[PDB]
Design a protein around this ligand. Sequence first.
Ligand SMILES: CCCCCCCCCC(=O)OC[C@H](COP(=O)([O-])OCCN)OC(=O)CCCCCCCCC
Ligand SMILES: CCCCCCCCCC(=O)OC[C@H](COP(=O)([O-])OCCN)OC(=O)CCCCCCCCC
Lengths: 78, 540, 256, 48
Amino acid sequence: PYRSILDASLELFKFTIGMGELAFQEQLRFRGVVLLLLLAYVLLTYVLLLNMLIALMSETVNHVADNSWSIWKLQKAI
Amino acid sequence: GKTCLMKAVLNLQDGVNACIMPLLQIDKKLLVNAQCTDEFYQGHSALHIAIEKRSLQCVKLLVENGADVHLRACGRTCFYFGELPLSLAACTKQWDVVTYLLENPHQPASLEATDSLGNTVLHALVMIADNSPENSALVIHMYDGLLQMGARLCPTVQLEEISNHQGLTPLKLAAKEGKIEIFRHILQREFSGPYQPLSRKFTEWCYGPVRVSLYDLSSVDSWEKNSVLEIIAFHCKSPNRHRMVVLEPLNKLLQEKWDRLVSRFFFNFACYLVYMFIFTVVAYHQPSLSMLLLGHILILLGGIYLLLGQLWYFWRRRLFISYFEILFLLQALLTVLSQVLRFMETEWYLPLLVLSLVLGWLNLLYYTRGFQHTGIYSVMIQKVILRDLLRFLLVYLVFLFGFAVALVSLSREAPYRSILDASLELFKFTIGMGELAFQEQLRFRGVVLLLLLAYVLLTYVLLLNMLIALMSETVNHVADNSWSIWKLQKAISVLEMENGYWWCRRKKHREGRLLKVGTRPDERWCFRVEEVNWAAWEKT
Amino acid sequence: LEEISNHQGLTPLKLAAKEGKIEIFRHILQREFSGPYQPLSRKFTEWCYGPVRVSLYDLSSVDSWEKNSVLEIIAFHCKSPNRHRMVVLEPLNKLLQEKWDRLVSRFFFNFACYLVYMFIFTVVAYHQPSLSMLLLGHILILLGGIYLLLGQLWYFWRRRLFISYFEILFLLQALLTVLSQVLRFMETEWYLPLLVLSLVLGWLNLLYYTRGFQHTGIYSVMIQKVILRDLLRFLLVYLVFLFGFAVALVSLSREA
Amino acid sequence: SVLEMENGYWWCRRKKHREGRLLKVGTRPDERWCFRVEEVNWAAWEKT
Ligand SMILES: CCCCCCCCCC(=O)OC[C@H](COP(=O)([O-])OCCN)OC(=O)CCCCCCCCC
Ligand SMILES: CCCCCCCCCC(=O)OC[C@H](COP(=O)([O-])OCCN)OC(=O)CCCCCCCCC
C-alpha cells in the first residue's frame, strides 16, 4: 500500500470514479495525518469539480442556440 | 437650548421675517452666535438653520446682521455634511446660498476654510455624495461650480489638493469611500475654457480616428507615499474596489506597470517553483530512520527568507487586516518549525514537513493570476466556491457527528466500534464507497438501515442545496466582473512588488513624463493614452 | 369608517392583509393627506433637514399589542402566497427590525438552552449501557422532554386556524423522548431505538435556529421551500420503481 | 419567530409592551401611537 509514487497516484486518482477507500488504516504510522491529508484531497477534488461545472455553466449561460447551428454550417463549408 | 434667535430664524412667510433684523437691532453677546448645546446638536445656529431652509433673503439678512459664516457646528442619525457654512450649500442644488456666501459683504467665507471635521467644501461635497445617479449629478454639478468659483477667490490656492485630519485629499477620499460616481468625474475632469488649468484630461492632436488623451497623475502614479492606487488596493473597504480599477487612466497605468514588472513576477514564480521542487525532492527521499544535507539547509534558508518576506508584509499594511498572503506566512512558519523540530522531538518533524509540502503545492496556485488565459479561471475558486463550501461543510459536520453518535449508541447489541469508525463510515457516503447493508450481526438492523437511508437522503439534500446555491450565484454573476476583479488582483500584485523586496528595497521610478499646459508654470507629470473612437469623432 | 369590524371581527385594514391584497394594502398602510384630510392620514413627515426625512406612521391595530392585528393575521391567519411580499413594505419592516433587535436577547437564550439540552441528550445516549450522573441525565432528559412537549402543545392549542414545518417536529421529538423515557419502565427492549430516533430528530431540528443569523437566513430558505417540495415527489417515483424491479428480480432469479 | 415569542413563554406568560410613542396631530385630541422611521432619499428630495 502506497509503496511508490505510482501506487499513491493511482489511489488518489481512484477518488474520481468513486471507488477509493478512505480508511484510518493503522498499519502505516501517522494514520491521523494520512486521514486528514486524504480528507483535504477529497475536498479539493470536489472544489475542482465544482469549479469546472461552474465554468461550464457560465459558458452555457452566455451561449446561444443559433451560434451552434452557424458554426455547424461553417464546419459543413469546411 | 434654542434661543430667541433660533425662534426668529424659524420658518416664516415668504421665507423671510423682519423680526430677525429687529431682534439683532434690539440686542444692541451677539444673538447671531447663539446656538443649541444639547448632545443631539451642539453649535447649530441661525447661520446653518437659515441656509438649510434655502432662504436667500434670510441668509443675506443674517449676514448683514453680523453673523460669522466661519462658525462651525458640532454634535450628533443626522446629516454627515461638514460643519462649515460654506459646505452647508451642499443642501441646495441651485447654489443659492453659496452665490452670496462667496464674496459676501463683510463676510468673505472663503472655500479654503477647513471644517471642524477637517474635510473642506470640496471634500464635504464628495463625502456627502451618494451612488444614486440623481445624487451623483447633484454632487458633480456642485463640485464643478465650486471648482470654477475657486479660480476667482484665492486663485493661488489649490482647493483640490488640501488634506483633512486623516491626511487625505478629496481625490483620495473619494477612492477610499468607494464612491465611483464622483471619482470617475474627478479623474477624467476636463475644461475647455479658462478652467483649463483645473482640468486633468487633455487632448493633444486628433488625427482621423486616432485620439491622443493626456491625463494628470498627481497623487495617482503610486510614487508618492500615499496615493489612489495604494488606498484602493489596501486601505479601501468598499465592495466597489473591483469597479474603480477598470476606469481609465488607472487601467492603462496598471497595464504599463504590469508590462514592466512581468520580468520580476516570472522571476519570482521561477524562484519559488524551484524552492517547491527542492522541497518535494527532499521530502520524497527523506530517510525513515551530503546532497540531502544541502537540501535541508536550503529549505531552512528558503523557509526563513519566505517567512521574513511575509512578516515584512504584515508589519506593513496594518489597517489592511489577502487570502494567499496568510498561507505563504503559514507555510514558511511550518517549514521553519519542522526544521527546528528536527533537533528535538523528531517524531513529529516529518508530519509537519508533509503538511508544509501540501500547503506549498496549494500556494503555487497564487501565481495563476499572472497569466491572461488563467486569470478568469483563478477567480471563481477564491470568490464564491470557498465562500459557500465552508458553510456547506459546517452543516455537513453537524450532521456527521450527530449521526455518528446515534449509530454508536444504537449499535450496542448482537464495525462502528467507536465515534471515529462510525464517522468515517458515514463520511464514506461522499466518495460513493460506503456500504448500505442490512447487517444482522448488530442488533436493530432495521433501525440502523433506516437511519443510514435517512443519512444518505440528507447528504443528497445538502449536496443539492450546495449546487442550487452555486447555480443561483452563477446566474447573478457576470463575465466582465471576473475580468475586473482579476485586474484588481493584478493591481494588488504590482503595487506590492513596486515597493521592492524587503531585503533590497528597490527604488521607485516616477511614471509618465513631465508636461505643462497653460500657466498657473503648471509643470506636472502626465501619462499619454492613445485611443481610437469613431463614435466620439463622429460628434465633431 | 375605517375602524368598524365586519361579522368576522376584522376591520378593512385587517381584511386587506388577510386576503393578501397587497395593492390596496400598501396604499392603506402608507396613506397620507396634505389638506383637511390630515387626521385621516397615517404617514406623516415631521421635519426634512437636507436629505434626511423623518417619517411617522400610525400603528393602530398594527403594533401586535392588540388581541388581533395585521402582523398576527399575516403570520398565522393568512393563506395567500403574498405573505412574503407584504412583510417587506414599511413600516412593517422597520417594526419587525425593532422587535428583532430587542428579542435577539431571548432568541439566543432559547438557542443556547436548547443546544445544551441536545448536548446532554447526546452525552446520555452515547454512554447508555447496553445491559449517579447518568441517572441525573435521564431525569433531566425527562424534564427537558416534558417541558418541550408542553411548549409545543401550547402552540397547537393556540393557532387553531393555522393548521409550520419545524413546529410539528419539535412536538414529535419531545413526544418520542417522553415515550422512550416511559418505555424504560416497560418493554425496555425498544427504548434505545426510540432514544436514537429522538436524538436524530433533535440534531435535525437544531437547523431551525439557523434563521436567526443574517449570514445563514438566505441559506436556510432553499432547503425547506423547494428541495423538500421536489425530493418527496422524486422519492415516491423512485420507490415505485424500486419495489417493482425488486419483485421482478426476485421472481426472475429462481433457478441455478 | 418574533410574534410567537412576543406572547411570552407558556409557563411565564410575559406581558406585552406597546410599541412606539404617543403622538397627536391635528384635532379629531387624536392621541395615537406612532413609530418614527428616519430615511434618507435624495431622489424624493429632488422633487421639492
Ligand atoms: C538566486 C538563488 C536563490 C535560491 C533560492 C532561495 C530561496 C527562494 C525562496 C522563495 O520561494 O522565494 C520567493 C521569492 C520571490 O517570490 P515572492 O516573495 O513574490 O513570493 C511570495 C509572494 N507572496 O524570492 C525572492 O524574492 C528572491 C529570489 C532570488 C533572488 C536573490 C535573493 C537574495 C536575498 C539576499
Ligand atoms: C435554566 C436552566 C434550564 C435547564 C434546561 C431545561 C430544559 C430545556 C429544554 C429546551 O430545549 O427548552 C427550550 C426552550 C427555549 O426554546 P424554544 O421553546 O423557543 O424552542 C422551541 C421552539 N420551537 O427553553 C425555555 O423556554 C426555557 C429556558 C430556561 C429558562 C427557565 C425555565 C423555567 C421553567 C419553569
